[PDB]
Each structure stands twice: as structure tokens, then as C-alpha cells.
Design an enzyme around this catalytic site. Structure first.
Site, mmCIF file in Angstrom:
data_model
loop_
_atom_site.group_PDB
_atom_site.id
_atom_site.type_symbol
_atom_site.label_atom_id
_atom_site.label_comp_id
_atom_site.label_asym_id
_atom_site.label_seq_id
_atom_site.Cartn_x
_atom_site.Cartn_y
_atom_site.Cartn_z
ATOM 1 N N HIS B 65 14.853 -1.433 -8.178
ATOM 2 C CA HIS B 65 13.539 -2.069 -8.203
ATOM 3 C C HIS B 65 12.512 -1.151 -8.862
ATOM 4 C CE1 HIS B 65 13.998 -0.290 -4.074
ATOM 5 N NE2 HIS B 65 12.719 0.086 -4.208
ATOM 6 N N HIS B 94 6.890 6.684 -6.871
ATOM 7 C CA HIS B 94 7.595 5.706 -7.674
ATOM 8 C C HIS B 94 6.580 4.964 -8.521
ATOM 9 C CE1 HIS B 94 6.420 4.097 -3.849
ATOM 10 N NE2 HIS B 94 6.114 3.011 -4.592
ATOM 11 N N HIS B 96 5.499 1.319 -11.007
ATOM 12 C CA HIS B 96 5.459 -0.120 -11.213
ATOM 13 C C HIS B 96 4.845 -0.343 -12.594
ATOM 14 C CE1 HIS B 96 6.158 -0.661 -6.891
ATOM 15 N NE2 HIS B 96 5.341 0.410 -6.760
ATOM 16 N N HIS B 119 2.801 5.780 -7.542
ATOM 17 C CA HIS B 119 2.510 5.811 -6.110
ATOM 18 C C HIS B 119 3.068 7.096 -5.528
ATOM 19 C CE1 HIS B 119 1.834 1.181 -5.669
ATOM 20 N NE2 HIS B 119 0.739 1.856 -6.092
ATOM 21 N N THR B 208 3.897 -1.916 -0.452
ATOM 22 C CA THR B 208 3.855 -3.076 -1.355
ATOM 23 C C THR B 208 5.260 -3.636 -1.611
ATOM 24 O OG1 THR B 208 3.986 -1.758 -3.326
ATOM 25 C CG2 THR B 208 1.761 -2.151 -2.509
ATOM 26 N N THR B 209 6.291 -3.118 -0.915
ATOM 27 C CA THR B 209 7.616 -3.750 -0.961
ATOM 28 C C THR B 209 8.064 -4.006 0.482
ATOM 29 O OG1 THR B 209 8.617 -1.663 -1.151
ATOM 30 C CG2 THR B 209 8.189 -2.761 -3.231
#
Ligand SMILES: *[C@@H]1O[C@H](CO)[C@@H](O[C@@H]2O[C@H](CO)[C@@H](O)[C@H](O)[C@H]2NC(C)=O)[C@H](O)[C@H]1NC(C)=O
Ligand SMILES: NS(=O)(=O)c1ccc(CCNC(=S)Nc2ccc(I)cc2)cc1
Ligand SMILES: NS(=O)(=O)c1ccc(CCNC(=S)Nc2ccc(I)cc2)cc1
Ligand SMILES: *[C@@H]1O[C@H](CO)[C@@H](O)[C@H](O)[C@H]1NC(C)=O
Ligand SMILES: *[C@@H]1O[C@H](CO)[C@@H](O)[C@H](O)[C@H]1NC(C)=O
Ligand SMILES: *[C@@H]1O[C@H](CO)[C@@H](O)[C@H](O)[C@H]1NC(C)=O
Ligand SMILES: *[C@@H]1O[C@H](CO)[C@@H](O)[C@H](O)[C@H]1NC(C)=O
Ligand SMILES: [Zn+2]
Ligand SMILES: [Zn+2]
Lengths: 279, 278
Positions: B65, B94, B96, B119, B208-209
Site C-alpha cells: 500500500h 511512509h 502517499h 508521514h 489514515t489507514t
């Protein structure tokens, strides 16, 4: 008027001959700001810019024939280098240097790299000297902040440097001819500074970058650029040069790079660098 | 199972598949609204700092992801109060990003999306002994959001990828899930010096996941660090995990949540910080 950027009779190569005090000196600006050959000095603190909230007077901008120069009213905008808000440095003016093209324009380079626009916020050392006209010609009288700007394709207006400049109240166009000046909304210099990291900068003793190149400037050049758009840089490029210039449109109004220590120096200077209390 | 791009397991369905806590009313990301936020002058400059005696290795994984840097324990810290006494310890970082340059961030600022949002995830070591105790407990976590923006003209040394040391070149098509590789350490202090660490949004929100736990103190810097199109395209070379519909990793962001959904039982406030001076 006796010097230019683009007329080879009066251009930057002639300044050392035409204004030997002090364009012939060996503490000249701008310089190449070299990360590897600079000394980190942890005692140099974050820069603060701050306004006298009870000042009322108008800001103007002038096409002086060489650059666009914002003139601040007296007793209004200040710099602190020490964390104390006690009016040691008082801002007088801000002017701009840019390129005919987006790959050049700035006076200083950082590791050889040229930015499209460099802004110079000029202050006098009010701690010592009571007026700018006293300070401009005297030892240690000035401190300038160099703000680099870089072009991005994707940004909201409100996050660009032009928001801090209030778009120069829309005054920049082909009719803004030397030596005209125009009233403008005030520049929010504190917002401008917040658009970059005010702890991260080069520091050295140098000179004014236009004649007489007086060697009385404490230089601070922030490493991180603020952001503008291609449309915004183009607004500067519509300004006309003064008649003593060869080129018609104002651009490439920057001095060639000077050495940190020319061969004739009698006391070398050191380039310093600052970063935040961290790491 | 969850995904970003498979409509059967994608973000619209999280509130049903992970009701604790993806159905909550303190969810992230949000739109960070300059005008509808409260300036709080007491919020100080953020500092990231390293334990210079740590020598353990850093790794990066394609987890299917995102690309996630995993830092060793006791190495990188955050201070929000100016003291370097290890209150927050960084665990991982990580990213996005979008299929295209005009989207990819999870947060927006006044409606605007950035191409890449990093993040930096930390736990409240001040209260909890380990990442695994903090990650599912109240007030356990603090995340830093770092926006990135593409510029055409820049030297590599002034891009974020200098701080990242290019992730040791691991971002490529062959970096398939769930491979992990050793990488050079990431200079998070340098990364932070690329923007203004006093100028940020602050609010209480969530991962946010899934499971979207509501235990995150968010700090989202307003000024972006800078990258090139070449650099953003490296992330886009990563393959998605087998439960995504899309093949190449991209658009791995959650949709925007409201600061205060209609069913909220106690409204939250978005705060803003700026440096002393004005
Ligand atoms: C910022 O200032 C410029 C002027 O310097 C504005 O540009 C003008 O735009 C309108 C057309 O929409 C016309 O008045 C002129 O064509 C423009 N002037 C020039 C020389 O380009 C610009 O709109 C301003 N931007 C903002 C956000 O206020
Ligand atoms: N490019 S630079 O930044 O190195 C540079 C800066 C400044 C000068 C000129 C100085 N003239 C000023 S500020 N005059 C002045 C000052 C106060 C008043 I009341 C009236 C006039 C030259 C170069
Ligand atoms: N997108 S986000 O920033 O809101 C976000 C989403 C999800 C997570 C939960 C991941 N859990 C962790 S950090 N497990 C973990 C614990 C110990 C160790 I050694 C390594 C890893 C974190 C952040
Ligand atoms: C601030 O502004 C007022 C009114 O213009 C002025 O009299 C006062 O001296 C200023 N303060 C300074 C320059 O510190
Ligand atoms: C600026 O412009 C006006 C109007 O043309 C002129 O009379 C004035 O003296 C000028 N002032 C400055 C700041 O030079
Ligand atoms: C720093 O690292 C050393 C050795 O790796 C370790 O023993 C020490 O606990 C660390 N300091 C912290 C986590 O505050
Ligand atoms: C990172 O990326 C580019 C390679 O194209 C390069 O110029 C830079 O040296 C690399 N640095 C390291 C540390 O690998
Ligand atoms: Zn100048
Ligand atoms: Zn994340």
C-alpha cells in the site's frame, strides 16, 4: 546613471575602474555560497522580522532604472538576530534582481546554482546609527537579507511570495517607467519569512552589490527558496530599463560572482552557515 | 482486507469493515483551512534530533500500500517543547502520492493537493514503553505530515531526496511487495530544515489507514519541501499489492474527512502555529 548592467561602457566589468572605493575591494558581494567550504556556527540564531504595529505611513515602490525597489516608511519594519525585539536593525528597502530567462537572475549562487529571482531586504544598524543616511556610508552600517525564489507550476496564490508582497498592488507593468514611484499596500515581511526556514542561512561580511559597492554589509542569505509562479516572474520582466542601459526590458540586473578571498586580501574572510537548534 | 483502488475493499467501505475506529468522528486526513483555524501562539517550533550513539540499520519495505521506512528503536526523536528528553520516539515514515502530479497528498491546504505527503510516525515514549503498546492506546501517537512540491530547476542537494539519500535506489519496478531492503539512514533533521518547522497545522485525529485509530496528535507543516518530476516518478514505479485493482502504486491516499461530522459528540478545533514575530 553612471553605471548599468548591460551597457558595456558602464557595465559591471567597469565598476572596479569607475568606483574604486569600493568596487575594487576584496570583501565584495555577491559570492558563491559553498556548503562544503563554509563553517557551521551554532551560535547564529533564527532571524525574526517584526513590525511596529502603531506605524501608519504608506509603502511605495519605484522603478529606479536598475531594479524594482520597495521603499518602507521609517520606524516600521525591523530585524532581530538575537531574539530581542528592541529595534537593533531597521528595514529601509527591498529590491529585486532577476533574469531574462528562468535559469538565471540571482546575485548569490548556492553551490554554483542560480535562482530566477533574489530579493534583498536592506536594513541599517539602528543600534549604532540614528538614520539610514548616516549608516549607508559608515563601517558596519548595513545588514541585508537575501531571499531566493524558485518557480513552481502548481501552487495556490496565497502560498506564493506574491501573497506576502500583496502582488505589489498590481503596479508592475510596461508603463511603470523610471524614475516613477507608486504607493502600494504594505508588504507582509513576516509572512514572507515564514515561507522559508529562517534558521537555515549563509552569513558573511561583504558589500553592496551596486556601486559604490561599500564593504559595510552583514549578509544573511537563506538557503531554502520561497515559491513563485512563471506568471509572477514575468511581471518583473515587463518593467523597462533606464535609458543608460542597452537592453530595453529590465532583466539580468545582477552583478557577476566575486571571490570570497581575492589574491590581494590582507585578512581573509570566512563564510559561515547556520542551522536550527536540533540534529 | 483493505485497499485503495479495489471498490470492494476501498476507502468507502472502511467505516463498515473496521468500525473501530474508521466509523469515528475524529478521522484524518482533513482539509486544513487557514481561515477556519485558531492561531495558538503557545505551540512551539518542532525539533527532530538523533541519538548519535545509535548504530542500528534502517530499512524500507514495499508493504503493498505504501513505501514504509522502518527506523531502529532509540534513534530518532521529536521534541515539541524545546527539551531533548526523548518524549516522542520516531518509528517509521511512509508516503502517499498520486498517479498524476496534481494529486497524491492525504491532507489538503485550503483545498489544494500536493503530489507527495510524507508521514513521520512517532510514539509518546513519555508515557508508553514501546511502539507496540502505544500504537493501539489513547494518546499513543504523534505524526508529522511533510508536503512535497515538484520544481523543474533545482540541484539534487537541495531536494528532499538528499535527506532521503535517494532511499539507496530501492524505488524501482523490481521492488515488489513485501520485500524489505536495508537503506542508508535518512537525515530527518536535514529534511525538516528544508521547510519552516514553526509553521504548521495541529489537530487531534486518526491513522489514515485501517483501523484508523483515533490516537494521533497531527502536525502538518504548511511549507512544502521540494522534489523533481524524476523523483516523484520513482515512487510510481513501485507495484501495488495483489489486492489492489490498479497495477502500479499510486493514488494511495484516503479521501478527505470532516473536522466535525454531524454525529460528533464533542467538536474538535483545528489549530495553527507560527514563529514568534509578526
Ligand atoms: C497581480 O498584478 C498584475 C499586474 O502587475 C495583474 O495582472 C493583470 O491582469 C489583468 C487581466 O486579468 C490585466 O489588468 C492585465 O493584463 C495584467 N497586467 C499585466 C501587466 O499582466 C494580476 O491580476 C494580479 N494578480 C492578482 C492575484 O492580484
Ligand atoms: N543590491 S544591495 O542590496 O547590495 C544594495 C543595497 C543598497 C544600495 C544603495 C543604498 N541606498 C539606499 S538604501 N538609500 C537610502 C537609504 C535611506 C534613505 I531615508 C534614503 C536613501 C546598493 C546596493
Ligand atoms: N497513514 S498514517 O500516517 O496515518 C498511519 C497509518 C497506519 C499506521 C499504523 C502502523 N503501525 C505501526 S507504526 N506498526 C509498527 C510497530 C512497531 C514496529 I518495530 C514497526 C511497525 C501508522 C501511521
Ligand atoms: C512606532 O510608530 C510610532 C508612530 O509612527 C512612532 O512614533 C514610534 O517611534 C515607532 N516605534 C519605533 C520606531 O520603535
Ligand atoms: C513619487 O511620485 C509622485 C507623483 O508623480 C511625486 O510627486 C513624488 O515626489 C514621488 N515621491 C517619491 C517617493 O520619490
Ligand atoms: C542511544 O543509543 C544507545 C546505544 O545504541 C542506547 O543504549 C541508548 O539507550 C540510546 N538512548 C536513548 C534511547 O535515549
Ligand atoms: C542520488 O540520485 C542522483 C542519481 O541520478 C545522484 O546525482 C545522487 O548522487 C545520488 N546520491 C546518492 C547518495 O546516491
Ligand atoms: Zn540588491
Ligand atoms: Zn500515512
Amino acid at each position: 546613471s553612471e553605471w548599468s548592467y548591460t551597457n558595456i561602457l558602464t557595465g559591471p566589468e567597469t565598476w572596479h575602474e569607475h568606483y574604486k572605493n569600493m568596487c575594487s575591494g576584496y570583501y565584495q558581494s555577491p559570492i558563491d555560497l559553498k556548503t562544503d567550504i563554509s563553517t557551521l556556527d551554532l551560535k547564529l540564531k533564527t532571524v525574526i522580522i517584526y513590525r511596529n504595529t502603531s506605524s501608519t505611513e504608506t509603502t511605495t515602490i519605484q522603478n529606479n532604472g536598475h531594479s524594482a525597489e520597495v521603499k518602507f516608511p521609517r520606524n516600521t519594519w525591523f530585524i532581530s538576530f538575537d531574539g530581542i525585539l528592541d529595534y537593533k536593525y531597521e528595514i529601509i528597502q527591498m529590491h529585486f534582481h532577476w533574469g531574462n530567462t528562468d535559469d538565471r537572475g540571482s546575485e548569490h549562487t548556492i553551490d554554483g546554482f542560480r535562482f530566477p529571482l533574489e530579493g534583498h531586504i536592506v536594513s541599517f544598524r539602528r543600534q549604532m546609527y540614528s538614520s539610514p543616511s548616516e549608516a549607508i556610508g559608515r563601517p558596519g552600517g548595513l545588514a541585508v537579507l537575501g531571499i531566493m525564489h524558485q518557480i513552481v507550476e502548481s501552487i495556490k496564490y496565497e502560498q506564493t511570495a506574491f501573497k506576502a508582497y500583496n502582488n505589489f498592488s498590481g503596479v508592475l507593468n510596461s508603463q511603470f517607467v523610471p524614475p516613477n514611484n507608486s504607493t502600494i499596500d504594505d508588504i507582509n515581511l513576516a509572512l514572507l519569512l515564514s515561507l522559508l526556514n529562517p534558521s537555515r542561512y549563509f552569513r558573511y561580511l561583504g558589500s553592496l552589490t551596486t556601486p559604490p559597492c561599500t564593504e559595510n554589509v552583514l549578509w544573511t542569505v537563506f538557503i531554502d527558496p520561497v515559491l513563485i509562479t512563471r506568471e509572477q516572474i514575468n511581471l518583473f520582466r515587463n518593467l523597462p530599463y533606464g535609458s543608460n542601459e542597452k537592453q530595453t526590458r529590465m532583466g539580468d540586473n545582477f552583478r557577476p560572482i566575486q571571490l570570497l578571498n581575492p589574491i590581494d586580501t590582507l585578512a581573509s574572510r570566512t563564510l559561515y552557515r547556520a542551522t536550527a537548534r536540533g540534529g
